[PDB]
Amino acid sequence: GYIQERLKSLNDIETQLCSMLQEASQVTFIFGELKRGNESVKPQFENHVKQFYERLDKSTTQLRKEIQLLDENVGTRLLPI
């Protein structure tokens, strides 16, 4: 159903947000490595920073669409207030 689709999109967003948190932990742990003089993980540092951004952009964009869809469904699938 339509509502099933919305919930699955929303669950998908929850997954993206968890992935973002995973990136943040990696960025953090890798910084500690760089500061200790382990320069070997510098490319991964830059990659995880870039991914956090890409994920921020994608998840917030999908969220904005979901809010729009709520608004369009007032009176049709969703009770007014």
Binding site: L7, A24, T28, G32, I67, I81
Partner: protein, 80 residues
């Protein structure tokens, strides 16, 4: 009341991008004895990055609260 959802979203994205940009600006360079010991520059940088991460976590949390509220509107206000 949905306008409030848009505005919360904009504000949270705004903060996340600022906090990430701040994190990007913390020197990654690898690590007068008294000065060195008092300022503890290398330690301070690690603390700064972790402080950014604490806030990245907090603000991602806010994105989850928003997502849940959208889920609940569908679950609760659908026409039977």
């Amino acid at each position: 009341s949905n306008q409030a959802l848009y505005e919360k979203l904009e504000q949270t994205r705004t903060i996340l991008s600022v906090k990430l940009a701040e994190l990007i600006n913390i020197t990654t360079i690898a690590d007068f004895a008294q000065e060195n010991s008092e300022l503890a520059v290398a330690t301070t940088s690690v603390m700064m990055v972790n402080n950014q991460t604490m806030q990245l976590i907090k603000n991602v949390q806010d994105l989850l609260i928003l997502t849940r509220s959208i889920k609940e509107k569908w679950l609760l206000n659908q026409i039977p």
